[PDB]
Amino acid sequence: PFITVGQENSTSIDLYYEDHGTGTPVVLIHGFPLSGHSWERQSAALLDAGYRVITYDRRGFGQSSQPTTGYDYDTFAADLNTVLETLDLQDAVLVGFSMGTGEVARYVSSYGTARIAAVAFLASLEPFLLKTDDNPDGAAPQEFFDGIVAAVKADRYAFYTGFFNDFYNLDENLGTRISEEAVRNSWNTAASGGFFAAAAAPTTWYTDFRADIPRIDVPALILHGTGDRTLPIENTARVFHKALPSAEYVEVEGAPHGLLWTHAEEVNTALLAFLAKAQEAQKQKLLTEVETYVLSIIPSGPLKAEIAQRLEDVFAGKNTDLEVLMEWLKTRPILSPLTKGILGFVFTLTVPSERGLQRRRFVQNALNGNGDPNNMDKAVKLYRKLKREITFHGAKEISLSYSAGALASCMGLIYNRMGAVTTEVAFGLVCATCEQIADS
Amino acid sequence: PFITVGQENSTSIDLYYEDHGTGTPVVLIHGFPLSGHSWERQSAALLDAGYRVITYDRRGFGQSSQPTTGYDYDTFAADLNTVLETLDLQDAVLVGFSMGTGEVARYVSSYGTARIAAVAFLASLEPFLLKTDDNPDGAAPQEFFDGIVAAVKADRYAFYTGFFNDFYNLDENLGTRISEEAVRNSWNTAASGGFFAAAAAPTTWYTDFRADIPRIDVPALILHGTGDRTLPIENTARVFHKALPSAEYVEVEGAPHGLLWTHAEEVNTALLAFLAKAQEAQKQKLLTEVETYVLSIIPSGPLKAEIAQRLEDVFAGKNTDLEVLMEWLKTRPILSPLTKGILGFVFTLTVPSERGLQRRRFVQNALNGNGDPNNMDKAVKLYRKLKREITFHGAKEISLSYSAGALASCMGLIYNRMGAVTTEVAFGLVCATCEQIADS
Amino acid sequence: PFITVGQENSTSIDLYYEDHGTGTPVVLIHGFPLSGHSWERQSAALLDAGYRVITYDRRGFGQSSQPTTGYDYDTFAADLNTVLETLDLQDAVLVGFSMGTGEVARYVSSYGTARIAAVAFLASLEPFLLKTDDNPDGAAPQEFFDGIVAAVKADRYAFYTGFFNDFYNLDENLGTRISEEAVRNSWNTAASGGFFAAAAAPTTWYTDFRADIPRIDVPALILHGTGDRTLPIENTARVFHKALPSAEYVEVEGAPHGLLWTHAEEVNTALLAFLAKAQEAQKQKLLTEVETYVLSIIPSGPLKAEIAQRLEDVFAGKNTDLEVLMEWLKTRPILSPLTKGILGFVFTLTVPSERGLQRRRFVQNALNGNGDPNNMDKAVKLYRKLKREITFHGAKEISLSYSAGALASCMGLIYNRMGAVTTEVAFGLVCATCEQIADS
Amino acid sequence: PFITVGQENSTSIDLYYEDHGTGTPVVLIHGFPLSGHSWERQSAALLDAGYRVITYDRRGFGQSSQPTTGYDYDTFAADLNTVLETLDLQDAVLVGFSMGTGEVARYVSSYGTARIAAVAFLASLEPFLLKTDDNPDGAAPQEFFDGIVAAVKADRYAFYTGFFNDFYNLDENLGTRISEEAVRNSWNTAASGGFFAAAAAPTTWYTDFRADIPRIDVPALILHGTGDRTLPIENTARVFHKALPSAEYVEVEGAPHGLLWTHAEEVNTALLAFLAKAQEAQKQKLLTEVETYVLSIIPSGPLKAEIAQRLEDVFAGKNTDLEVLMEWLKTRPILSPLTKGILGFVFTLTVPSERGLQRRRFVQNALNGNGDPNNMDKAVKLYRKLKREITFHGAKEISLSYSAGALASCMGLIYNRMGAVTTEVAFGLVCATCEQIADS
C-alpha cells in the first residue's frame, strides 16, 4: 500500500502507509530512524479498543521511496496532508513520536484542524531544540547536531548501534524492558532506510516550532519520558507544556526516548484514555447536531420540550426502556406521522440495547414513502451512494440532492433491515431529511 | 356522477352512477321503473359489511340521460361493460334485480367473466318470459306484453300507481312491510324516468336469455319471491334453477316482486351470506394452490408434514397464535432461512388477525436480498408491475422473469410495509419465488 | 426469389427458388443439366391438385449463383436443408429427378425426416452408379464418367445437343412426345448454367448412396422409365427396389430418362396418387384440430354431440345442404350468437360448394363485432398480418395477440368478402378465436 | 509479482507470489512464519525436473500485504482459490507445509479438485490439533495455544528465536544439517511478517480439518518428520494416515518440523517420485479414457475388441510394426472411413518409431473434411488456439466448441505436418472429436 506525495525526475515519490480496523481514525507518525511498524505495540492496543489505526513511513524511511530532496517539515507536513486528503479522513486524531511530533505541529499550523479532532505528542521536539541566545531553553547548540550529521555520513550502519544505545537506554532496559532480538530488528529497520535520508533527517530536529504551537486548537496530549537522553525532558516537554497548558500533560517516570516499546504499558493507557475522552467528544457533538435538526421540524410547544429532553437523556446515558419511548412516541397527539417515524428511527439508533424489540409498526408505515415505486427507485439509488459513505457531513450533503419523499423512503429502507449504513451515515440521512421539512 | 356510454343527436348518452365504500366491488343493477337509489336497503347492508357499492341508473331511468334509442339487452350490456371498464373493476360482483338480471346474464355471455367474481339474480327474468310452443315455460304470450306497452303509452303516470300495486303486493304489505310514503317515492322515481324508456322497456322483458345462461361460470345466486306477481316463481326462477343447478337457490316465502324493500331483512342476509361463501370459496382454491408451491421447496420428511399441517390448520380456520407459529418457525433446524422467510411471509398473509405482532426480525433478514442494491433496483421495477396487477396467474407469470434474488428482495419489500399489492398478487409472487427454488 | 446457402469470396451463393400454391408443400429438385422450370408439367398438375409447389435451382444451374466450389452431395444436401429450414416447411414431400434423387437420399440420411412426411424418387441414381468389383450392379465403370467430364470441358455447348438426344430418346419421341421447340428450350437452360458446374456435376453421379438408403423411414415412391438410356432401369431402380422394398414401385413402359415431359401423363398420375394418400391425411388432422377448437366453446350437452357429428360429416364428404345446416344452426336455443357465427363461418369454409347461397344475415350480425370502430381498427390490423400468412400455426399464433372482439370482427371482415386469406389461415383465425372464448 | 485476493480500508490485500519454469504447475504453500522463499531447496529440484514452480506468501507473511482481518482457513483457502483461478492452472499439484497443509485440505474440501491433479501434505496439521474429550488424538489442549498467542503478543521478535530452536531442532541439526546463517535468515523472514498475523496465525492451527479429509479424491502424499516437535508425528500424520489410507505415506527418520531445509535430500526424492508416478498413472487413465472415447464411436462387436487390444498393446510397450497396424486398419470391413482416420492418427502418435513410413493415404482422405473451404477456415482458427495449449483438459475443452466436421479437418491438418502441437494437446483434439461423434 503506497500513496504518491510527490514526483522526482521520471519517478514519483510514494509513501508506504497502512490502514486497519474500523472506527475513529488515529494516524500514527513514527520517529527517527524507524518506520510505521514501530507502532505495533500501540497499533495492537488501539485496534483492540475499536479504533482505526493508520500508519505511514516517512520519506526515506521504511518501505517508502528514498528521495534525495525535500527533507524539511514544510514538506513532511505536505506529505502528511496528501495522505490525509487521499484517505478523506474526518474527525481524525494525529499521534506523533520524535520527528513525528514535528509533522503534527506543522500540519496543524499550516493546514488547520479541519479533519483533525485531537492531537498527541509523544517524546516531543517542540518547541525548539536548537540552543541559542534568544532561545536558551534549547537542548543543544548547533555544533551538536552538525556532529550527528557528520557521524551518519561517516558510517550510518555503525551509527545505528550506537544511536540505539541512547534510544532505548540499553544500559538500563536491555533484557528487561526490551529484548536483544527487538533491538536487532530496529537496526535492520534503520538500515533499510535511505542513505540520504539518514544524513538529512538530523538537520530537521532543531526546527523552530514556536510559531506552530498557537495554531493548536483541538484537545492535545503531551507525553514524554523523564529518562529521555536524546530529547531532555526539561528542554522539550516541560517548556512545551508552558506553551500549551490546556494540553493533557503526562510524564512517564524513568522512560527512555523509545518509550513506545520499553514503556508501552504506560503509553497505551495514557493514549487510550486520551482517545476515549476525544471519541466521546466527537460522538456527542454529532448527537446534539442530530437533535437540533430533528427539533427543527417540530412545532414549538410543551411537546417539543419533552422530545428534546428524552433525546438528551438517551444521548447522555440515562437509558430509557426503548419499548417505553416507542409506546410514548406513537401515542403522541399533534405530531405528524412523518415526524414520529423520524424520531423512532433516531431512538433505535441511539439507544444502546435493542432489547429484542421488533421493528415498530408505526415507524414502518411512516417511512414507507406513500408506497410509490418512483420514490423507492430514488431511495435505492441513494442507498447505493450511502453504502460507500463513512462520514456524517459526507452522507448528509449527498442526501440533500434527493427529494424529501425519496429520503423518507430510504430512511425506512434502512430501518427495515433492507439496507446497511454506518451510524454516522444514518444520522446524515436523518439530518438531510429534517432539512427538507424545515424549508416548507 | 355520470359515465358516457353512447351518443344521441347533438347530445351524449350519460348514465348517473354512484360508487361508495371500500373493498370488493359490488355492482347493483336496478329494475323497472326505479333507479339505483332503490338499492338503499341493500346499499347500507353491503357498506356495513365493508364492500364497495357501485350502482348506476339504466338509460331512460333515474338521473341517467333519456335517449329514444338502444333499448335492448345487447345495448344494456354494452352500457354495463363501459361502466365496468371505465371504473376498471376487478373481482367484482354483479347483482341484478328485475330487468337487472337480464343485464347480468347478457354481459357474462357477451363480454365474459374476466372482471366478474360472482353473480346474483334477484327476481330473475331468465330464462325466457315469452310463452310460445317451443317455450311453454313462458309466463305470458306476446299479446300480454303488447298490452303493457300500450298501457304505458296511454298514461304512463297513471300506469305506475297500478304497476306498483302488484310490485309490492300492497293489498298485503302496505302499512306493514312498506309504508305509504315509500310507495310515493317509487312513483316519483317512475315519473322522473324517460317517457320513451317507460314504453320501450316492456318489450325487452321477454328476451330469450337461454343462450346466455350456459356462459355463467362464476358462482351464482338465484333468489326469488314466491308471491311475485309480475314474474311468476314457476315461470322464472324455478325453471332458471333447472337451467343452472350449480347456482345457490333461495325462495323467499310470500315476497312480492319488490322484495328488496318489503323483505330487505331476508334478501340482505341471503345476499351477504352468498358473497361471504363465494369470497371464501375462491380464497380456499387459492390457498391450497399456494400450499403446493410452498411444499415444493421443502425436503420430504416429517417436517414437511408439520408445515403442511400448520398451513392446512390456518387455511381452514383453526386460528393458531401467530406469535406461536413464528416462534416455532424460527427455531426449526434443517430449514433454509429463505424458506423460513417465505413461510413467515405466507403465515402473516393468511392469518386473520395480526394481534399487534410486530414484523418478525428473522423474516426481514431472510428477505433482505443480501442487502445488495442491485437486488432492490430489480425489486422496485417488479413491484411497479405488481401494483397494476390484481390476478394470481397474472402476477405470478410476470414475476418469473426476475432473478430469485430479486424476487426474495421484492417479497421483503412488501413484508416491511414498503409496498402494497393485493393478497392474490402477493401469493403470485410467493408461488413464483417457490417455482425458482424448485428448479435448483 | 433467392435463398443464400453459402458464401464464395466477395460474392454470395444464392439459389433461385420458387414457391406457389397453398397446401401440402412439395419440394421438386431438378436434374442435370436443367433447372426448376423443367418441372412445369408436374408443377401445373400439382397446383391443380391443391398442393404447394416449391422448386429451386441447384448451384451452378438455372438462375442460381454459379460458384466454382462445393459440388458434392454433402454440400448439395446442406443447400437443400437451408432452403427447407428458411421456409420452415412442415410435413413436406421431397420429389427428386436425376441428380435430384441424390439430394433427397442424402438429406434424409444426414438431417433426418423431421420436416419430411414423404419422399419420391423419379429416375433414381440410387444406390450406386459406379461399377466396381464390390458393386457389380453399377451402371458404368470409372472411365465412362471421366469421359463425360472431359467432353463437357471440351465443348459443353455442343455436348448438350448430344446429351439431350439420349435424355429424351429423340430417335423415338421427337415430333410425337416432345416437340422441336421444347428441346430448344432445354438446350438454352443447359447453356445458361455455369461452365464450371457443367463439368463438376458429372463426378457426383457415381456417389455411393448405399449408406443413405436405410435412413429412409417415411413412405417412399420409386418411379423409373424402362427406356432410360442415361440411367439403365436394371442398374438403378430395380436394384434400388431391392434395397427399399417398402417403397411404392412404378415402371413406366418405354419411357426415356426425361419422362417428366415425354411421359408427363403417366408420371403425374403416379405421383399424384402417391401424394394423394399423404395429402388427405394431413388435411384431416387440420379439420379435426379445427373441430376440437370449435367444440371448446360449446356447452357440454346433446347439442355438442350433434354439432360434432355434422362437422365430421362435412369433413368426410357427406355434403349436407349448406342451407339446411345454416337453418338448423340459426334455430338453436342455448347457443350463443357468436358461437353460431363461428360455426356458420366454418361450415361455409369447409363445404365444397357455396351453392349460390348469399352470405347469411344472422352470421353478419354475429361477427359484426358490436359495431365498435375500435374493434374494427384492431380487426383490420390483424387482417393485414393474415394476408402475408400462409400456415395454420403461423396465422393462429399471431391472431392470439388480438382481443376476442377484434378476432370476431376480423372473422366477419373476411365473411363479408371484404378480406381475403388462404383457407389454412382462415382456420387459424377461427381456432384463435375459439381459444380466447375458452379462457373466459 | 502480486495478486489481489481481497480489499481492506482504502488499501487492497495483495499477495506476493512467484511462478517459474515450464511444465506441470506445482503450487507450494509455505508455513509459519516463513515465506515462499523457504521452498528454495524444493523449488530448484522441481525446476530441474522440468516442472512449473509456483509459490506465494500467505497474507501477513513475507512480502504479501499485512491485513488485520481474515485469519481463518476459509479465508486462507479463498485466497488460494483466487491465485489458482487468476493463473488459470490445469492439472496442478498442491503441496502444503505446516499451515500450508490446511489450505490444501480446505480448498479441496470446499472448491473441489477441478483444477487439481494431485496433493501433498508435508508436516500436516490434519486432522485436528486441539485436544478435547471428543478428540483425544489432539496434540495439545487449548491452554497451550493461548500461551503461544500471549508469548507472541509480548515480544514476537524474541519469540521467533525460541520458536526456530524447536522448528529446526537446533540442538541436534545446527552446524550439520542447517547453518547458523540459514537460521538467521529465517528469523529475518519471520520479522518481516505482520505483527498481527504473527499472533493471529497460532489460533488457526487447531482448526478442525476432519470434515475436509473425506473430500480428497486425487492421489495424495503424506510426508512427516518423526522428530517433529511442533507437530508430534502421532497426533498429526499417523492419525491422518488412518483417515486417508489411499495416500502414499512417508516417514523421514529423525526429521524436525522444518524438514524442508534440514532433510531436503529425502523430501526432494520422495516428492519427485510421487509427482512422476501420478502423471504416468493418470496417463494410463487417460489412454484408456482415450481408448474408450475412440471405442465410443466404434460399433460393439468382435472388431471393437481387436481395436481395443491393439491400442493396449502399443500403449504398454509391445511395439507392433506401424506398417502392419496401418495395413490391418485400412482393410477392415464395417468400419467408418472417419473412424479409420482417427485410429490412424492415434497409432502414429503413440508408436515410438515412425520407421520412415510416409503419411498414410487412406488417413489423409478420411480427415480431409469433405474438402469444404468452410470446414478448413474453422479448423485453422481452432489450430491457432490449440498451439498455445499445453494441457489435455485445456486443449480438449476448447475444441468441443467447434463442429465435428471442423475437428476432423483440424486433425488431418496436423497429420499432414501442416501443424505442430504437443502430444497432450493432440490427444485433447482426438477426445473432443470422438465426443462429438458419440452424440449422433
Give the domain tally of chain A.
3
Question: CATH superfamily of the largest domain in chain A, called what?
Answer: Alpha/Beta hydrolase fold, catalytic domain
Order of helices and strands of chain A: EEEHEHEHEHHHHEHEHHHHHHHHHH
The quaternary structure here is: part of a larger assembly
Percent of residues of chain A in helical segments? 40-55%
Class from helix and strand fractions of chain A: alpha/beta
Taking the alpha carbons of the first and last residues of chain A, their distance comes to 48 Å
Please state the second-level CATH architecture of the largest domain in chain A: 3-Layer(aba) Sandwich
Structural shape of chain A = elongated
Largest interface (C-beta under 8 Å): A-B, 26 and 26 residues
CATH class wording of the largest domain in chain A? Alpha Beta
The spatial strand order of the largest sheet of chain A comes to: 1-2-4-3-5-6-7-8
CATH topology of the largest domain in chain A: Rossmann fold
Give the biggest beta sheet of chain A.
Answer: 8 strands, mixed
Keywords (chains A, B, C, D): Antibiotic biosynthesis, Oxidoreductase, Peroxidase, Plasmid
Family (chains A, B, C, D): Belongs to the AB hydrolase superfamily. Bacterial non-heme haloperoxidase / perhydrolase family.
GO molecular function (chains A, B, C, D): peroxidase activity
InterPro entries (chains A, B, C, D): AB_hydrolase, AB_hydrolase_1, AB_hydrolase_fold, Epox_hydrolase-like
